[PDB]
Structures are given as structure tokens and as C-alpha cells.
Design a protein around this nucleic acid. Structure first.
Ligand SMILES: [Mg+2]
Ligand SMILES: [Mg+2]
Ligand SMILES: [Mg+2]
Ligand SMILES: [Mg+2]
Ligand SMILES: [Mg+2]
Ligand SMILES: [Mg+2]
Ligand SMILES: [Mg+2]
Ligand SMILES: [Mg+2]
Ligand SMILES: [Mg+2]
Ligand SMILES: [Mg+2]
Ligand SMILES: [Mg+2]
Ligand SMILES: [Mg+2]
Ligand SMILES: [Mg+2]
Ligand SMILES: [Mg+2]
Ligand SMILES: [Mg+2]
Ligand SMILES: [Mg+2]
Ligand SMILES: [Mg+2]
Ligand SMILES: [Mg+2]
Ligand SMILES: [Mg+2]
Ligand SMILES: [Mg+2]
Ligand SMILES: [Mg+2]
Ligand SMILES: [Mg+2]
Ligand SMILES: [Mg+2]
Ligand SMILES: [Mg+2]
Ligand SMILES: [Mg+2]
Ligand SMILES: [Mg+2]
Ligand SMILES: [Mg+2]
Ligand SMILES: [Mg+2]
Ligand SMILES: [Mg+2]
Ligand SMILES: [Mg+2]
Ligand SMILES: [Mg+2]
Ligand SMILES: [Mg+2]
Ligand SMILES: [Mg+2]
Ligand SMILES: [Mg+2]
Ligand SMILES: [Mg+2]
Ligand SMILES: [Mg+2]
Ligand SMILES: [Mg+2]
Ligand SMILES: [Mg+2]
Ligand SMILES: [Mg+2]
Ligand SMILES: [Mg+2]
Ligand SMILES: [Mg+2]
Ligand SMILES: [Mg+2]
Ligand SMILES: [Mg+2]
Ligand SMILES: [Mg+2]
Ligand SMILES: [Mg+2]
Ligand SMILES: [Mg+2]
Ligand SMILES: [Mg+2]
Ligand SMILES: [Mg+2]
Ligand SMILES: [Mg+2]
Ligand SMILES: [Mg+2]
Ligand SMILES: [Mg+2]
Ligand SMILES: [Mg+2]
Ligand SMILES: [Mg+2]
Ligand SMILES: [Mg+2]
Ligand SMILES: [Mg+2]
Ligand SMILES: [Mg+2]
Ligand SMILES: [Mg+2]
Ligand SMILES: [Mg+2]
Ligand SMILES: [Mg+2]
Ligand SMILES: [Mg+2]
Ligand SMILES: [Mg+2]
Ligand SMILES: [Mg+2]
Ligand SMILES: [Mg+2]
Ligand SMILES: [Mg+2]
Ligand SMILES: [Mg+2]
Ligand SMILES: [Mg+2]
Ligand SMILES: [Mg+2]
Ligand SMILES: [Mg+2]
Ligand SMILES: [Mg+2]
Ligand SMILES: [Mg+2]
Ligand SMILES: [Mg+2]
Ligand SMILES: [Mg+2]
Ligand SMILES: [Mg+2]
Ligand SMILES: [Mg+2]
Ligand SMILES: [Mg+2]
Ligand SMILES: [Mg+2]
Lengths: 46, 271
RNA sequence: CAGGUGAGCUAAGCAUGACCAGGUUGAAACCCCCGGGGGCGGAGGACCGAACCGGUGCCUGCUGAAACAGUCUCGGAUGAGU
RNA sequence: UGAGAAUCUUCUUCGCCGUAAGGACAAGGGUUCCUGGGGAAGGGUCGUCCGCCCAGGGAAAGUCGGGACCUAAGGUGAGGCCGAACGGCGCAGCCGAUGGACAGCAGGUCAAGAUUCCUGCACCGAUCAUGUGGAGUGAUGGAGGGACGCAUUACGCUAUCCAAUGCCAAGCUAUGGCUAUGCUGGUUGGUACGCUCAAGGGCGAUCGGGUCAGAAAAUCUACCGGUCUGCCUCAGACGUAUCGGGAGCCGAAGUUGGAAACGCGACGGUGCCAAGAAAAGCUUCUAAACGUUGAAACAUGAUUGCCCGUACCGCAAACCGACACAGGUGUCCGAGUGUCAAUGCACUAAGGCGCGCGAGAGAACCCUCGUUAAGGAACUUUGCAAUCUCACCCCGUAACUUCGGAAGAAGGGGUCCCCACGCUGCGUGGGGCGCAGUGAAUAGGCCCAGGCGACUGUUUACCAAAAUCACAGCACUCUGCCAACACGAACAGUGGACGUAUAGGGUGUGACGCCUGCCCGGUGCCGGAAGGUCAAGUGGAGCGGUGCAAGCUGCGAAAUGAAGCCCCGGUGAACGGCGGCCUAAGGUAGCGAAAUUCCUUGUCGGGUAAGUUCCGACCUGCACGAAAGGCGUAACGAUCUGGGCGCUGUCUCAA
């Protein structure tokens, strides 16, 4: 009974990846929003 | 002489299929088929535009010569009439005296190997590309230009014909397949005669999917949609009221053309 | 209401690859004897039935083995297929 | 073993999967791999054990996958087109495998890696040297080719499996027998070389002309004319050698007959229509340039061979399901016996496992089951469920029909063992055994008659699969090509469509058959456009301020101003209407107690002992009706309704 999470590394990083977020002002906003919150992770890149 | 079937299956009796005997059984021409058709209904932004275009058989384009003006004065031999997807009309391969091969629409008749003559001075044989000026009045012609150069745009579905009528100082009147009486410039080329495979129109599809083989996804009525998706909404039974389409309008009688400069360029008789 | 995040589930499209045991039936066309008989041929959104795809009816399950299943039964099964 | 054992280790039986519950991969996980140790907690009990804790090792590539190559969709994108901003597009080029391209196989082994390492022997490209040759090379450009669908199907062959009184290897046996003709196991992989055997497969061949063809070039392509079975090829087999492996107590044998792939020969043949990528590598040409007494190429030797991945799990206890989860998870291989066939069913090889609480006991009750007197649907909303039917062969099969079908209609018969005979395992006779012969497993209940929908199909992830939806067919209607139509800040760009009226868009009917009547009054729309009305604008005649006045300035008509509406025709496969003891008309066919009937269990007939159901007539159609289609229709349905056969614990009535 198929589940929501089928992992896929190229998909996980093509979406969600730091280079992917940097392409868009929303994603650069996600990046700085995380740097400010001070997360250790910041992206699926880590 | 279209092929038929016995009813060995429930939906095979009503089917019809075209007569391929005269088509030459050969591969399309490796250079003339640039191929590469994407075959998507989704347009530039991925949103459905012409609704219900779907899968079906993959096709290739084969480039067709619509202007037929760079070969003026050169004879051509008809290599082989042959099948083509993406056209209601069959097309004819032809080899030029300088050895160029090129595709064209097939007129009705035209047995393989017939000579054809493009240009201004070429005689009104079947298959020649001619200016409207040299065409005698009342002859059957297809592959009609709307403007000099560019290419043929009128009469190109199977069996369509255009009728020359009178003549002006340059412009020549013609009867379009709708019966529209439109003027067209003297320098427009045309191919004499009617298009080949004249009786495509009588083919019966005979089952649902056979149109899927043509890439036509099922076409829903808006009688079935919920009022969210179509102005023919729910209604607990089945009906209609007001007669409007997807985005609302009039599908039974409404004038839809606009107020273009094209309107003065044809006698008003139309459809 | 605003600006975002999501088609890795699912709803479709596109490009490109792959899969569908076996058995039944015997369309044209082609060839003989007088549309009919014989051969021949191997067509089909044809038949039966595994994978596979799907969920027809009861029952069980009901603080489950499982936040939608299980046994049995059932639909298709070369096509509008997976 | 141990402090402690139903559970950890080993041995011998047992049972369970075996197109898997075996094996190999991809994902994806990340040390879970191996060794030595540990016992808190995680392990549904235990625990000395573990996929858990600790420490330490294991992971090797010029040839496998990717990269240093190519391109599809897609994403980019100097220039370029747009757009309050952020940005949206966008030619070339570039990225981008799921595809194209490309050089090795056989064997061995750590505790743990293997086309990687080692052993044997190959190939690839590159550089250089020696020599032959001793001169032409021959581009981001041209050309060929690479380059492709589906179904069937002929011939050879391999993988691979079967048989034997073929060979080889080892030993026994005993129970009552066999003394081996019995039992068990094995019975070739690679490479090199052949005047060895070989289906199948490919390919014609130059001379010349024309410029108008490939940008120009061209000795290469295309066009055009003249000119005469054969070559090439090995799939695979056979021999010699060799190098391995090889049952076994270091190394034996390697035969004969048969079966046989989706694999190989091949890019085979044939049929079909829905008409089936691109690009570089590659082959061939010249342009420019470099030379034409240190060429292209070939032979040998030497030298060089970069990056990333490879452990382990990988239909699952190591991935997705919060779990050591009955769930799912793409590709490949998947033996034998029997059974028409098969990846089916039953048993089993290899291999793998008994599902991480156990032991008793044999109450009620509950779940999955086996048999059941007599009766047989009486049960009940309904035969729901459970019987019954069951595979193959022979015989035989209706109303109806679109002539194809209904059809596996129905119904009856055979089925096992032995012997003789005939034919190529069948048929022919005979005999035999049981209750019984598809002996166990898998393996249709059928008929009559309706309603609805023609049909295959599609659907509400997780209470509805249908009479819904779609469907071919039909109809209206639009749209002349920057087409109507749609996405869109957009004279951007796209889709329609590299389509052009036999096409494209919308709407509704929904195969086929006979058909589809009346009513333009309202509403819509299409035409007309004498007249009515109608904005800004043009006009500014006049009515007023304020100044001594020039002048400045607030209002401001008439006429003239478009579409559009009022008005006038028409249009129904436009929205619709076709009735109440005047409205535009008032129901053409067909049907009718309907899926439509309130009164209603309508009346009569049918069928049952008994029929609110059901079927056929009637018509009083509350409240049918003609492409929101009317009347039929063969075939079809996990569709609904009524009946009958058959058999059943559904039931009498439970044991
Ligand atoms: Mg889930
Ligand atoms: Mg990283
Ligand atoms: Mg339609
Ligand atoms: Mg609805
Ligand atoms: Mg609406
Ligand atoms: Mg409505
Ligand atoms: Mg209704
Ligand atoms: Mg719309
Ligand atoms: Mg079928
Ligand atoms: Mg049938
Ligand atoms: Mg479904
Ligand atoms: Mg069935
Ligand atoms: Mg001790
Ligand atoms: Mg203890
Ligand atoms: Mg011992
Ligand atoms: Mg496995
Ligand atoms: Mg990985
Ligand atoms: Mg271990
Ligand atoms: Mg250990
Ligand atoms: Mg412990
Ligand atoms: Mg414990
Ligand atoms: Mg254990
Ligand atoms: Mg490496
Ligand atoms: Mg090596
Ligand atoms: Mg590679
Ligand atoms: Mg872009
Ligand atoms: Mg790519
Ligand atoms: Mg690949
Ligand atoms: Mg290779
Ligand atoms: Mg060792
Ligand atoms: Mg190993
Ligand atoms: Mg196939
Ligand atoms: Mg024997
Ligand atoms: Mg040369
Ligand atoms: Mg396969
Ligand atoms: Mg390139
Ligand atoms: Mg491994
Ligand atoms: Mg790893
Ligand atoms: Mg869960
Ligand atoms: Mg599990
Ligand atoms: Mg097999
Ligand atoms: Mg087997
Ligand atoms: Mg067998
Ligand atoms: Mg089985
Ligand atoms: Mg395992
Ligand atoms: Mg166990
Ligand atoms: Mg039971
Ligand atoms: Mg009984
Ligand atoms: Mg009886
Ligand atoms: Mg009763
Ligand atoms: Mg019943
Ligand atoms: Mg019911
Ligand atoms: Mg039942
Ligand atoms: Mg009759
Ligand atoms: Mg018949
Ligand atoms: Mg029968
Ligand atoms: Mg007897
Ligand atoms: Mg008998
Ligand atoms: Mg039996
Ligand atoms: Mg049984
Ligand atoms: Mg239906
Ligand atoms: Mg069916
Ligand atoms: Mg549901
Ligand atoms: Mg359901
Ligand atoms: Mg434009
Ligand atoms: Mg309808
Ligand atoms: Mg009644
Ligand atoms: Mg009734
Ligand atoms: Mg009806
Ligand atoms: Mg009665
Ligand atoms: Mg009745
Ligand atoms: Mg009607
Ligand atoms: Mg209907
Ligand atoms: Mg039937
Ligand atoms: Mg169905
Ligand atoms: Mg019944």
C-alpha cells in the first residue's frame, strides 16, 4: 500500500537543494530565513 | 474501393479504412523528414489549451514544399505517391532535373511518373504550380497562396478544390471550399485540379480508441460536469438552459470574426 | 486576505526504455471445385486463463497483522493496455 | 557453553516455500559486512545470541556503470522580444539518460572485496623508436550511414534439460529378494590453428552528361542516360593443441539419441495502418593550410593508461509503511516428475526457512473447517452463503440473428492397468481391478422471461462500478488563417498548428433500424436598419458675476454626434411550450398502471395450493413522446427484476 515518501536523491536535491533555492528570490529568502533562525542544516544539501 | 470487414467483432463491422494500394510502400525520405514533432496539447506554459489532445501514434514531419517557386522553369518527374501522417491528403515525391527531391500535395489522379512543370510559362497540366494570371477561368485548382511567396494556404485538405471566377486588374476572384468568394492576388501560385485521396471523408472510425490512435482524447460533454467546471452545471437530472460553451458564449449562431482589414478584400458572399 | 512551500502521494501531459505463460477461435486477402464447398492463411478495442493491472459478494478484521487489509469469490487478461 | 538455557552453538531425524518463501541487480539505506569482545537498554518471553553496545579490519578497474563523447522532453540561455518592480519569453550554443556510442574472457582465493587483485592468455587508444612505405594529409562545411512501428511466421543453432546395459569414479549390500544389466555421483569452460561440416544473412558494378540540386568547392552524394547464378560472411558444430575446471582418494571419464528458448544467426519473410526520435562516434569529399628526398598506412618493440561507483540489505528484520509491521517496491535468471500445453496444479533438487512467549487442558461461546437420517429453499428482503457443476475427447444442441453469433446452449458418452495388432502416442480388439478410473490438486451450475445501457472500456485513493461517464455514428453552429478558440504583467511569446474548410473549436444526442410531428407569441441568435431614443465630442445662441473700462471668468441651450436598445422579418438536432369541467399553439407516429400510476394490491388473463412482485392485454397517461430523442433491436453486463430446473444444514432442527 504505497506510501507518500518514495525517496529519490536526484529529486530530493533537484528540488530543495541549495543551488535550486538560490535560483529564485524566494529561495534566497528561504536561505537567509534559515541562517537567521540559525539552523544547523539550512538545506537538504546540509 | 475502401476496405471493409465482416462483423467478427462487435465494433469491426462499422469501421472503414482507406485504400492504400496506389501508395508506394517506401520509407519517407531521410532528409525530407526533419521529424521531431513534440505532440503536446499543453502550450508554452504547460496549461491545457486545445482540450482533449492526447496520446496516439507517434509521427514524424516530412517537409513539404508549399511555395514551389524556386524551381521555376524546371521539369519534375513524379517518383512515387506515398502515405503521410498529419495530412488528410496524400503527398507525392518528385525528382527535379537538377536532382533535388521534394514533396508536394497529391492532386486527384496523377499516376506515378507523370511530368510536372513549375513556373510562369508552364502549361496548365495537372500538378503544375502556376500564377493566377495564366490560369484559365473556372478551372479546378488547389494549393493556393494567400500572398506571393510565403506558400500555399488555401485548399490542402484531401478533396478540396478552388474555383477561379472572374478577374480584375491584378486580383482574381476564387471560390473557396466553404463557397466563400475571396479575391486573391494574381501572383499567388496554385496547383491545378482537386487534391488526391478525394474520398477520405467517408472513412468510418468504427470504435472509440481508433480516434485515440489519432491522438484525440475523449471529449466530455458539459452536461456531465459539475457547475464548478462548466455553465451546464448539475441539475439532479439532465438538461441545458441558455446554450453557452466552456467559457460562456454562443456556439449555436454567433458571429465571431472581428473587424479586420481582410473583410474588404473579399466579396461578401460566404459560407 | 498576503507571500511563499509542495506533482517524491495522486490527477494528466511529454521524452525515452521496458513487460503481457500457456491454450481456444479461425476475418480478409490468395488458390482450386459448383455467393456456396475445400485448402491456405493468421485478423481482431475476439474467447479462456498465469503473472501483472482492478477490486464484484459474503465473512473476518473493528483499542486491527494493516490509519482501508486478509482468506475465499470475482472484472480485464494485444489494448482506450501495464 | 554457561553464574543462570524451552530459546545460543553443533549433530541426527521432522515439517514448510521452491516463477520462491532460491539467486542477481536498481533504487534507496549507510558500516547494518568480517573478527574478537559485551549483556544495561532495543529483541513483544528468555538470552551466554543479534541487523543491538565496544574496539579493530574489509571496500582495489585503461576494457563493467557514469565522467573526460552525443543528443530527446525538459531546463538554460551573450545577442534579441516584452513587462510597475522581482521578472515573463527567447534563435544559435549549452546542460540534461530513461536512449545512441565504446576495448577481455576463462579460472583462483582473505574471516570479510572481485569482468577490479592474483594466474593464464587477449584487446583498446595514445607517444616514441626500428623498418617497410618512401609521399599526400585530407576540416566546427557537403554527402552517406547511424535511423528505429506492430502482429505473425519459415530454416539452422546455442544456452539448457531428459534417456540409456555409453564411459568414469566409490563402495556396499543384508530386511523376503537383487550380487549386477543393482544402487550413487560425474559425464566440459576459454583460447589458438584448420585445403574440415554449416543453415541463415549482406551485396549489384563502373564510364559519362547537365547545371538549374547539396553555400562555393569536390575525385564524395543526388538526377539522368551507356555499359557484364557470382562475391563476402560466419551463428554454431567437428578435429588437434593447450590452459583451466572436474567427481573424488593429487585428479578419472568425458559417449549416443532426443527436447529446446523471448537468446544468437539477422538490420530474415510476410501481412497491417494507427505510418513508427535526435546527435556524435563512423565511411566518404573537397576549402583553407601544411608539404611534396625524414607522408597516409602497416609491422614489431617499448612506454602510458586519469576521476567517480563497487562492503552489506536489496519482494525486505537492513528501502517506503511512527514497529525485527500479514501491506507495498522497477528489471533479470528461476531445475525436475506427472498432467494435451504452460511461468498452471501437486510433490520435490539446489538453496532457503519453522514466521523471537511457551507449556497444559480438552467447558459455554467465537473464528476457519469436515461429514450429516428423512425433507429439500419450507429459510429469507433476496438461494445471501454453502453445496451442486469442473479439465481433455467423441456425439449432439433451440427461439432469435446485424448471418459473424447466441454456443462451452442445452443434453449424452468416454477417461485406469495389462496383452496382441495397425499407424509416425493414438485407434482396433480382448482381458483385469475397485465403491470409485482428469481416482489426490488446480478446472464452468444451467434454462426461460423482462427493465436499462448497443457493444470493449472509464469512475467516487478509504461505505456507491451502476442504468453514471466516455465511445464510433449523427446534428446544429462557428472559423479565409498573425483562423475562430484558449494560457498570458505583454503590439512578448506560445498552443491550436509546422494543421488551413474532407481542417480546426464549441454544444447536444449516443452503434444499427424505422424514424424525429405541431407552435417565432416571449428569450436567445441571424438578417433589416423608414422611424423613436442614446455619450463624449463639434457648436456656443443666451443667463450671470467682477471690474471705470479693455478684459477675465461661472453656467449654459438648438442643431449636429457611433455602436447599442425600441421597431420589422426569420431561425427549434436554439432556451422552451404542446392545457383549464383563450395563449403561439394545443400531441404526427410510436409507447402506456412504465425506472414515469396518485387513487393502487386498477380490471381480466398467465404462472403458484395461495402472487402487493412479476409477464401479457386494456386503457381513466394525477404527472409519456419524438436527437434534455420516440419506438424496436441481435450480441454484450461481477447490471437490476420475475420464474423454472439441478444440489445443497439457508431451513424443519440441529448433531
Ligand atoms: Mg502512506
Ligand atoms: Mg552534498
Ligand atoms: Mg462527439
Ligand atoms: Mg455531476
Ligand atoms: Mg459558471
Ligand atoms: Mg444546468
Ligand atoms: Mg429530470
Ligand atoms: Mg474556455
Ligand atoms: Mg480482448
Ligand atoms: Mg461468447
Ligand atoms: Mg480505479
Ligand atoms: Mg466471466
Ligand atoms: Mg560446565
Ligand atoms: Mg540473568
Ligand atoms: Mg557430537
Ligand atoms: Mg529473493
Ligand atoms: Mg547506492
Ligand atoms: Mg554478522
Ligand atoms: Mg562476530
Ligand atoms: Mg540483556
Ligand atoms: Mg527481555
Ligand atoms: Mg536464533
Ligand atoms: Mg576505481
Ligand atoms: Mg586488468
Ligand atoms: Mg560508458
Ligand atoms: Mg527560460
Ligand atoms: Mg540528455
Ligand atoms: Mg543506460
Ligand atoms: Mg564495451
Ligand atoms: Mg586463505
Ligand atoms: Mg562475495
Ligand atoms: Mg511481442
Ligand atoms: Mg536404469
Ligand atoms: Mg580520394
Ligand atoms: Mg523477460
Ligand atoms: Mg554537437
Ligand atoms: Mg556483491
Ligand atoms: Mg556503498
Ligand atoms: Mg502505520
Ligand atoms: Mg514485512
Ligand atoms: Mg524457465
Ligand atoms: Mg517448472
Ligand atoms: Mg511438466
Ligand atoms: Mg505454483
Ligand atoms: Mg533472505
Ligand atoms: Mg524458528
Ligand atoms: Mg469454514
Ligand atoms: Mg442432510
Ligand atoms: Mg430434488
Ligand atoms: Mg417465512
Ligand atoms: Mg432469489
Ligand atoms: Mg437487494
Ligand atoms: Mg452464492
Ligand atoms: Mg428463422
Ligand atoms: Mg449458425
Ligand atoms: Mg458443454
Ligand atoms: Mg467391480
Ligand atoms: Mg468403467
Ligand atoms: Mg482424480
Ligand atoms: Mg480438494
Ligand atoms: Mg454499459
Ligand atoms: Mg470483455
Ligand atoms: Mg469507494
Ligand atoms: Mg465498492
Ligand atoms: Mg506577434
Ligand atoms: Mg445524453
Ligand atoms: Mg400491477
Ligand atoms: Mg414495474
Ligand atoms: Mg424508456
Ligand atoms: Mg393475478
Ligand atoms: Mg405490465
Ligand atoms: Mg427532443
Ligand atoms: Mg437514450
Ligand atoms: Mg449473453
Ligand atoms: Mg464492464
Ligand atoms: Mg434467480
Amino acid at each position: 500500500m504505497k506510501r507518500t515518501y518514495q525517496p529519490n536523491n536526484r529529486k530530493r536535491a533537484k528540488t530543495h537543494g541549495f543551488r535550486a533555492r538560490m535560483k529564485t528570490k524566494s529561495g534566497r529568502n528561504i536561505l537567509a530565513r534559515r541562517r537567521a533562525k540559525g539552523r544547523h542544516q539550512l538545506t537538504v544539501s546540509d | 474501393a475502401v476496405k471493409k470487414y465482416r462483423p467478427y467483432t462487435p465494433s469491426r463491422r462499422q469501421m472503414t479504412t482507406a485504400d492504400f494500394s496506389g501508395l508506394t510502400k517506401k520509407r519517407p525520405e531521410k532528409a525530407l523528414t526533419e521529424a521531431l514533432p513534440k505532440t503536446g496539447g499543453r502550450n508554452n506554459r504547460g496549461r491545457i489549451t486545445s482540450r482533449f489532445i492526447g496520446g496516439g501514434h507517434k509521427r514524424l514531419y516530412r517537409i513539404i514544399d508549399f511555395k514551389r517557386r524556386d524551381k521555376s522553369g524546371v521539369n519534375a518527374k513524379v517518383a512515387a505517391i506515398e502515405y503521410d501522417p498529419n495530412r488528410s491528403a496524400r503527398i507525392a515525391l518528385l525528382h527535379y532535373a537538377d536532382g533535388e527531391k521534394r514533396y508536394i500535395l497529391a492532386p486527384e489522379g496523377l499516376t506515378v511518373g507523370a511530368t510536372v512543370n513549375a513556373g510562369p510559362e508552364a502549361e496548365p497540366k495537372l500538378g503544375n504550380a502556376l500564377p493566377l494570371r495564366f490560369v484559365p477561368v473556372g478551372a479546378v485548382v488547389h494549393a493556393l497562396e494567400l500572398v506571393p511567396g510565403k506558400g500555399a494556404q488555401l485548399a490542402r485538405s484531401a478533396g478540396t478544390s478552388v474555383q477561379v471566377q472572374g478577374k480584375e486588374s491584378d486580383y482574381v476572384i476564387v471560390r473557396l471550399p466553404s463557397g466563400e468568394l475571396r479575391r486573391v492576388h494574381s501572383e499567388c501560385y496554385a496547383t491545378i485540379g482537386a487534391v488526391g485521396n478525394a474520398e477520405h471523408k467517408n472513412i468510418v472510425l468504427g470504435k472509440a480508441g481508433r480516434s485515440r490512435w489519432l491522438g484525440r482524447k475523449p471529449h466530455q460533454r458539459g452536461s456531465a460536469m459539475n457547475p464548478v467546471d462548466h455553465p451546464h452545471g448539475g441539475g439532479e437530472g439532465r438538461t441545458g438552459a441558455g446554450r453557452v460553451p466552456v467559457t460562456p458564449w454562443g456556439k449555436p449562431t454567433k458571429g465571431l470574426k472581428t473587424r479586420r482589414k481582410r473583410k474588404t478584400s473579399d466579396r461578401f458572399i460566404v459560407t
